[PDB]
Amino acid sequence: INGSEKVLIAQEKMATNTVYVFAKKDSKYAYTGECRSCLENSSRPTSTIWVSMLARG
Amino acid sequence: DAEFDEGFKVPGFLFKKLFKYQQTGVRWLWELHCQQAGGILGDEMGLGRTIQIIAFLAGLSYSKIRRFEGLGPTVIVCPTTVMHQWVKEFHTWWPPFRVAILHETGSYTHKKEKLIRDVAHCHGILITSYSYIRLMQDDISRYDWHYVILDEGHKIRNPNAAVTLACKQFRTPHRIILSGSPMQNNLRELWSLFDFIFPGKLGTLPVFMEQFSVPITMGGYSNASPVQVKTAYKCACVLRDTINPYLLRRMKSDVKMSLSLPDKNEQVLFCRLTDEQHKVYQNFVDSKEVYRILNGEMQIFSGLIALRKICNHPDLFSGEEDQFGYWKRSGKMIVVESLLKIWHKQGQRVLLFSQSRQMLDILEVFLRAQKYTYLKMDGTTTIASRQPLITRYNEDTSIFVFLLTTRVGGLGVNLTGANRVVIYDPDWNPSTDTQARERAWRIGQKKQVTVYRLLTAGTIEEKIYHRQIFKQFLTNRVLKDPKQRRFFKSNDLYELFTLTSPDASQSTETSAIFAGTPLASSSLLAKMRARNHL
Amino acid sequence: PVPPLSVRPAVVMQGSARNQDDLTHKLADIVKINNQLRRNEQNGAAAHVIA
Amino acid sequence: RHGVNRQDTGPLMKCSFEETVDVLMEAAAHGESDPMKGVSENIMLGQLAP
DNA sequence: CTAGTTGATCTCATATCAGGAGAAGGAGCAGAGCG
DNA sequence: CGCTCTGCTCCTTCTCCCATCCTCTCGATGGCTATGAGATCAACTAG
């Protein structure tokens, strides 16, 4: 580009369409299951859906 | 001597000299003086308004009505080009008024403040220019003036100008405006004039706008919903009757039978763009500059000026038989060639108008390229030598075409010897082009005068003409009759950065738009419910 | 208070184009809207427009 | 900042540490006067630190 | 002294996700006098 | 017997901070509205 050799660096990201159950120590939720969902042929950003459990008390 | 109701002895040997409308005007001026209000003598040019004013002030001085034994010190603010005329009018009608001009030419030969002090000390008649009001706005307004007459009071058309503020800093209840047209562009101007003559009648400018100007113009478009036009008509009626007892305007329809007026015909030529001019205009309307204008990132006004220059001539915008301003490169100058040739073969005499002085010089060079004798007067000519030029054109026939811009010279410089007139390019103001056509066709015009307005179809200039007509319609609705057939579209009228040149298969936009061509509490209630159903 | 030119120097680029400081651009916006508000209060403007 | 800029050390010493704008603005609102006793204040004014 | 010309100057027109930590306010509310 | 005046706790904003110094490359950045007429005025350029 404009005589300058430019190299694209591969960028890490969490995989999509997979359910990942984490547990944040400092939060109102005990457990949270997230899913960054994205249609096969991308047209919009990743729509993250969370399904959490409220912490006891 | 003629006598009025409370007693105002206008002298007989003056009052007899007036005409009927003039006597009506003197009556009205004195009705205001009793009410202690101001007003606008909105009679258009040529009726004679200075005569009415001198008549009324003379009657007020002789009648010794009283504060002040008779008429006190009065200031007249008029353009420089008419001050000497004013003093002569006084000296020929009512000599005993000690009239004095405030000017560098003047006659005082001493400190000008001493002139103000002396004239006020003698209850004289002092004439100034608007500039002296603006400059000495603090000094001149200390001597308890009894009358203020703003002749050609449309200089106060702008409520923001320093001249307006300086003129509204006068204190007397008696403010008279002598303007041929109280409003010229929109209702800003009417409000400013009324804020001068009578500070309170029309409200503050925000209120006046939001009540009148917006509903009215929204009802000036043919695509307006019926409710919008009906509201516009109602508000126009309210404004009309609100201003009725303070604006005395008479046309050349009722007074026509008293004075002769030769017939005037007018055409609007639609001049196709030349192919090179067409290409330049299309490149500009496709270039990124107008795109940035549409984005609002750059001021649209340069785009306007550029497109006007292009329609005038490509050499303006762009910058043998190829020298500067060659007349074959724009269609409007093709048409000017044809008209000038034909009229010279007819032996007539031409006024050649243009808003641009640069293209005025272009046209000068074109006339040198031809063998037409001519004369030029513009802003660059010294004022002291302006009268000779006009006289030399008017007295002989050995000069064919006289070059003007629409705005040079005093209002209505007497160009009578001309027969035909051409407005090479339209202006935004209807009043300036109207003045241009009126300048040739005045009182004491011997031959039929015709006006040819040169348009380039489908361009910016067609839109300028449309806007001129729209403003004229606005003024007419406000001043003569609210009911009017609606001609225009809002979006088409306001979007003015396009190019649709006619191919002669379809008619031009203008022709398409102009395709057709005590109260007994029951009369009070009846009028209220009538106005409210509208 | 609008600061002096030292606080917001107009540095000249390689050519003749004089680049203004961020403070100067902001003061330009402030003066623009201040003049705009001054005229809108002086001449016809709606209350919501002034607001 | 919650312990060091809450003592009576003077606004110029405090602005050197943290919350430069908040400290100087508080000092302006309250008309505080820095007696130029610390080393930071003299260093800023190019004076010989005590 | 007297006009007149010629510059400069100014006014007025016409344009529409993997932070953290502490400090302050606010709100819910338990409870104690006490009118 | 119902109101006031606390003052405790939970949450919620909200705002502040995140080592020092040094080298290099690379890209982006650029702001333009006109025109003319009138009037003033002060200086010559003649009288």
UniProtKB/Swiss-Prot annotation, chain B:
A motif (CSA-interacting motif (CIM)) lies at residues 521-533. Essential factor involved in transcription-coupled nucleotide excision repair (TC-NER), a process during which RNA polymerase II-blocking lesions are rapidly removed from the transcribed strand of active genes. Plays a central role in the initiation of the TC-NER process: specifically recognizes and binds RNA polymerase II stalled at a lesion, and mediates recruitment of ERCC8/CSA, initiating DNA damage excision by TFIIH recruitment. Disulfide bonds: none annotated. Phosphorylation at these two sites promotes the intramolecular interaction of the N-terminal domain with the helicase ATP-binding domain, thereby probably releasing the inhibitory effect of the N-terminal domain on its ATPase activity. Phosphorylation is essential for its chromatin remodeling activity. The gene is ERCC6. Residues 335-494 form the Helicase C-terminal domain. This is DNA excision repair protein ERCC-6. It comes from Homo sapiens (Human). The CSA-interacting motif (CIM) mediates interaction and recruitment of ERCC8/CSA. A C-terminal ubiquitin-binding domain (UBD) is essential for transcription-coupled nucleotide excision repair activity, interaction with RNA polymerase II, association with chromatin after UV irradiation and for mediating the UV-induced translocation of ERRC8 to the nuclear matrix. It is linked to Cockayne syndrome B: A rare disorder characterized by cutaneous sensitivity to sunlight, abnormal and slow growth, cachectic dwarfism, progeroid appearance, progressive pigmentary retinopathy and sensorineural deafness. There is delayed neural development and severe progressive neurologic degeneration resulting in intellectual disability. Cerebro-oculo-facio-skeletal syndrome 1: A disorder of prenatal onset characterized by microcephaly, congenital cataracts, facial dysmorphism, neurogenic arthrogryposis, growth failure and severe psychomotor retardation. COFS is considered to be part of the nucleotide-excision repair disorders spectrum that include also xeroderma pigmentosum, trichothiodystrophy and Cockayne syndrome.
UniProtKB/Swiss-Prot annotation, chain D:
Transmembrane segments: none annotated. It comes from the Eukaryota. It is found in: Nucleus; Cytoplasm; Chromosome. DNA template strand binds at residue 1. DNA nontemplate strand binds at residue 6. The tandem heptapeptide repeats in the C-terminal domain (CTD) can be highly phosphorylated. The phosphorylation activates Pol II. Phosphorylation occurs mainly at residues 'Ser-2' and 'Ser-5' of the heptapeptide repeat and is mediated, at least, by CDK7 and CDK9. POLR2A associated with DNA is specifically phosphorylated at 'Ser-5' of the CTD by CDK7, promoting transcription initiation by triggering dissociation from DNA. Phosphorylated at 'Ser-2', Ser-5' and 'Ser-7' of the CTD by CDK9 (P-TEFb complex), promoting transcription elongation. Among tandem heptapeptide repeats of the C-terminal domain (CTD) some do not match the Y-S-P-T-S-P-S consensus, the seventh serine residue 'Ser-7' being replaced by a lysine. 'Lys-7' in these non-consensus heptapeptide repeats can be alternatively acetylated, methylated and dimethylated. EP300 is one of the enzyme able to acetylate 'Lys-7'. Acetylation at 'Lys-7' of non-consensus heptapeptide repeats is associated with 'Ser-2' phosphorylation and active transcription. Regulates initiation or early elongation steps of transcription specially for inducible genes. Catalytic core component of RNA polymerase II (Pol II), a DNA-dependent RNA polymerase which synthesizes mRNA precursors and many functional non-coding RNAs using the four ribonucleoside triphosphates as substrates. Pol II-mediated transcription cycle proceeds through transcription initiation, transcription elongation and transcription termination stages. Component of the RNA polymerase II (Pol II) core complex consisting of 12 subunits: a ten-subunit catalytic core composed of POLR2A/RPB1, POLR2B/RPB2, POLR2C/RPB3, POLR2I/RPB9, POLR2J/RPB11, POLR2E/RPABC1, POLR2F/RPABC2, POLR2H/RPABC3, POLR2K/RPABC4 and POLR2L/RPABC5 and a mobile stalk composed of two subunits POLR2D/RPB4 and POLR2G/RPB7, protruding from the core and functioning primarily in transcription initiation. Part of Pol II(G) complex, in which Pol II core associates with an additional subunit POLR2M; unlike conventional Pol II, Pol II(G) functions as a transcriptional repressor. The C-terminal domain (CTD) serves as a platform for assembly of factors that regulate transcription initiation, elongation, termination and mRNA processing. Belongs to the RNA polymerase beta' chain family. This is DNA-directed RNA polymerase II subunit RPB1. It comes from Cricetulus griseus. The gene is POLR2A. The chain holds residues 1416 to 1465 of 1970 of the full protein.
